[PDB]
Scaffold this active site. Sequence first.
Site, short mmCIF file in Angstrom:
data_model
loop_
_atom_site.label_atom_id
_atom_site.label_comp_id
_atom_site.label_asym_id
_atom_site.label_seq_id
_atom_site.Cartn_x
_atom_site.Cartn_y
_atom_site.Cartn_z
N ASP A 155 -11.74 -5.89 -0.41
CA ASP A 155 -12.76 -5.81 0.58
C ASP A 155 -14.21 -5.46 -0.08
OD1 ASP A 155 -13.80 -5.62 3.08
OD2 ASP A 155 -12.34 -4.30 3.84
N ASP A 188 -15.37 -10.24 10.99
CA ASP A 188 -14.02 -9.92 11.49
C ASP A 188 -13.57 -10.48 12.67
OD1 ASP A 188 -14.05 -8.43 8.88
OD2 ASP A 188 -13.77 -6.42 10.01
C1 LIG Z 1 -13.46 -3.83 7.60
N1 LIG Z 1 -12.32 -4.37 6.86
C2 LIG Z 1 -12.36 -5.98 6.74
C3 LIG Z 1 -11.33 -6.39 7.83
O1 LIG Z 1 -10.76 -7.58 7.61
C4 LIG Z 1 -10.20 -5.30 7.72
O2 LIG Z 1 -9.67 -5.43 6.25
C5 LIG Z 1 -10.89 -4.17 7.41
C6 LIG Z 1 -10.49 -2.77 6.52
O3 LIG Z 1 -11.10 -1.69 6.77
#
Ligand SMILES: CN1C[C@@H](O)[C@@H](O)[C@H]1CO
Lengths: 390, 393
Positions: free
Chosen positions: A139, A200
């Site tokens: 991430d 997302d």
């Molecule tokens: C904001 N991130 C990206 C979304 O895909 C999840 O992985 C979340 C974990 O915190």
Amino acid sequence: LDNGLARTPTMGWLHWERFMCNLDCQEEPDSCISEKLFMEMAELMVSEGWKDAGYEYLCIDDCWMAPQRDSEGRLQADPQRFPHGIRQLANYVHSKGLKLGIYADVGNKTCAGFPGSFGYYDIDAQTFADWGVDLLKFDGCYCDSLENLADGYKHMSLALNRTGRSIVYSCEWPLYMWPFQKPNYTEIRQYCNHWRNFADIDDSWKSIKSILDWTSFNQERIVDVAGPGGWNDPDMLVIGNFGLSWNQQVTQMALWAIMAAPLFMSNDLRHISPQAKALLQDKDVIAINQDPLGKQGYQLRQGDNFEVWERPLSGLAWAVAMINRQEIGGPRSYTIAVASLGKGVACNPACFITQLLPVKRKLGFYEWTSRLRSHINPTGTVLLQLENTM
Amino acid sequence: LDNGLARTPTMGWLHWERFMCNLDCQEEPDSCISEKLFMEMAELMVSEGWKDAGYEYLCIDDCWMAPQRDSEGRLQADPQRFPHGIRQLANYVHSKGLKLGIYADVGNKTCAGFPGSFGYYDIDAQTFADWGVDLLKFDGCYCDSLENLADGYKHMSLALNRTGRSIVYSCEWPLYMWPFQKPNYTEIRQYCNHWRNFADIDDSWKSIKSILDWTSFNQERIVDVAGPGGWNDPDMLVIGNFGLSWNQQVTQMALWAIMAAPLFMSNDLRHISPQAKALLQDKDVIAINQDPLGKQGYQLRQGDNFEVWERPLSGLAWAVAMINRQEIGGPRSYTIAVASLGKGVACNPACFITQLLPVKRKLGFYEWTSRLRSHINPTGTVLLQLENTMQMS
Ligand SMILES: CN1C[C@@H](O)[C@@H](O)[C@H]1CO
Ligand SMILES: *[C@@H]1O[C@H](CO)[C@@H](O[C@@H]2O[C@H](CO)[C@@H](O[C@@H]3O[C@H](CO)[C@@H](O)[C@H](O[C@H]4O[C@H](CO)[C@@H](O)[C@H](O)[C@@H]4O)[C@@H]3O)[C@H](O)[C@H]2NC(C)=O)[C@H](O)[C@H]1NC(C)=O
Ligand SMILES: *[C@@H]1O[C@H](CO)[C@@H](O[C@@H]2O[C@H](CO)[C@@H](O)[C@H](O)[C@H]2NC(C)=O)[C@H](O)[C@H]1NC(C)=O
Ligand SMILES: *[C@@H]1O[C@H](CO)[C@@H](O[C@@H]2O[C@H](CO)[C@@H](O)[C@H](O)[C@H]2NC(C)=O)[C@H](O)[C@H]1NC(C)=O
Ligand SMILES: *[C@@H]1O[C@H](CO)[C@@H](O)[C@H](O)[C@H]1NC(C)=O
Ligand SMILES: *[C@@H]1O[C@H](CO)[C@@H](O)[C@H](O)[C@H]1NC(C)=O
Ligand SMILES: *[C@@H]1O[C@H](CO)[C@@H](O)[C@H](O)[C@H]1NC(C)=O
Ligand SMILES: CN1C[C@@H](O)[C@@H](O)[C@H]1CO
């Protein structure tokens, strides 16, 4: 990424969309992010036919870590929610014939606030490899500069290679770059097995629509870079949850097949309808998604609240998807000349057309002069496979 | 409207959302607006248990008319699509034990462009009455002034009265006022059996959300106006079509029950899943919607992507709906003191609570001091019935 992995889009299960960052194991033991949840998912992946269908990677997302690193500066799983540790969980998952994915962050913290990997790329890579991890989702939160973002993604890629363990590398690099400068997808593909492009997903038709619209708007930039070893990632499948009607679930499945997308289910395998299970396990649609040629499809046409997408397949076959974006009324008629499909090659001199979604139906032989007529449900998709008569 | 009709919210079927203005009977015979469609819909309303559940009014919406009036200045049904005419269609509908609704427009044209009723209010009312029409939906397109809109709605109400035939009067008056000024709902209620307040529904969760949010935002202005003979109309039920998930369908059914809404299905009764049918034919939820007290419910609470609505029912009972508006994750826990429900009356000294939606389950006796704990699906609703009781277990 030429690591010999993800020669077809990765298929598996990822906890984020359905289970998120639930840490309340006292009040919600059965849905908190815990080692027991992943054991249960692994058992069902074997017993309920998911592994047979091709879903192979059981992936942990954010909120598995302990609040701080251990004495030697390595990441650790939460002591209470993962009492036996990630290496032991990976051993169990491997004993079921499955692979284990895990999560980390290029910046100083994960998006949920747990230890980031900046400054620890090599130790974290080697830790994951020691644990037996088979996939890493990386991430991009809490990263102060575009330089640090790029350097971190490349550095972690090379560190994973250096461990000598085969580890699928899933990046969010483009998504966190886009607000500031245009991603160079050749470079990203050089370093990543697949990459998140857009915001997302959540459990909503609005989310599906906006992902599809972004993909088709940017398709000149992202379609051709994809192929064996490197895929565009439009985020998780949310089929089997709560926010999508049947026809919207069909649309997601069909178009994730068209887009040569990784197929990461994010649902509750313990509580899933037979209908959703049959859709997610559809052999013909998965075969389209898993086509060894690995050429990503694209939007061919758009108009009158209709969309036509198509994808070239191995052996002169094509996949064609027709979406009805009008959200009122009933099944709407759409016609197109088959000579306009597959760049004019699919049905020359003829093709046999089989509808796969919403139901499987042989439609018959279509000559190069023919027109394909279909009725498409509001927010639904008709998915077809075209086989040239050779 | 004190015509003795609509003492509970009207229940029936209306073609608009699912079939719209499809005139292409050659290329789209199964969904064009034709007399055959309404004959078949009536047959299935009888055979598939819709009439038994309470759905009584088979309603024609826009696009039934011929392009212009006849020699005698009356409206006529389209010669090609309704060759046998409205009188015969009404006879057929009545022979199945059903009632027939039709559509017209206060202005010079219907929204789809067919003959309007301005200048012909009395002839059109008498035409419908002669045909055997039992309900009229009166649209507001092609009307230039509040002057004409108000005068026309009042006029058509009185013209229908003059016929001596019982005709449910469905108005879109408030909705068409909003561009100019706020409706006087006491006056509208004087003339109408129910009235559309908000924009047309479509087959989407976005639509449900926006109707609910408008209703709860304006609830101080419209909730108390409703009652036997005059209802707020949040538009058709779209359960059984394509755009709503199961939990979103549950939410619409539950909250149309809470809101004392007319229940006009707009679907294809020939192609409807057993699950949607069971939801639309749910005896207990319909009973809530049809409660003889006829007091419209309201939003009690809002926060943390949760909504709590409640509706007072006859005999110290309450309906309570809990919506989870978070569109990600899984079922979310919500707890509330039972004393905060039903104005503190529902569970004093106790209440028996029965969950009706998403599934029917007796939850048991809750004393006035107790707390109700529930789990609600994303975009779903938990619907409960609270029965006041002096028993404890
Ligand atoms: C904001 N991130 C990206 C979304 O895909 C999840 O992985 C979340 C974990 O915190
Ligand atoms: C044309 O308009 C007039 C009024 O402008 C309208 O007359 C009204 O009819 C209603 C319904 O029949 C009358 O209300 C009834 O009055 C009688 C006698 O007082 C009562 O016994 C009735 O009670 C029964 O029905 C009620 C439901 O309406 C129940 O609550 C009750 O328990 C009983 O079952 C009922 O209240 C009303 O009195 C007249 N008003 C006037 C001024 O005459 C007429 O019906 C309209 N005609 C058409 C064709 O629309
Ligand atoms: C580390 O990177 C090297 C080079 O990028 C990878 O080597 C490739 O492996 C595939 C399949 O194993 C071969 O088809 C290529 O020809 C190899 N390329 C080169 C230049 O050798 C290697 O797989 C990576 N190792 C790990 C553990 O990821
Ligand atoms: C995008 O990145 C790629 C790889 O980092 C760049 O391609 C390289 O360009 C140099 C010339 O400067 C060549 O020597 C390499 O062989 C290229 N590598 C590959 C894999 O093609 C590319 O120039 C970048 N594009 C832009 C617009 O900056
Ligand atoms: C992490 O924090 C330090 C100090 O606060 C900073 O120098 C560094 O750039 C940060 N790293 C990232 C990737 O933001
Ligand atoms: C209908 O059209 C006529 C002719 O222009 C016009 O005089 C009249 O005001 C219109 N009526 C309404 C209600 O708009
Ligand atoms: C609304 O109209 C009715 C009927 O004329 C009248 O009794 C009432 O006072 C009106 N309200 C306002 C605020 O004008
Ligand atoms: C726009 N109107 C209002 C809607 O409810 C239908 O009646 C449609 C007919 O044209």
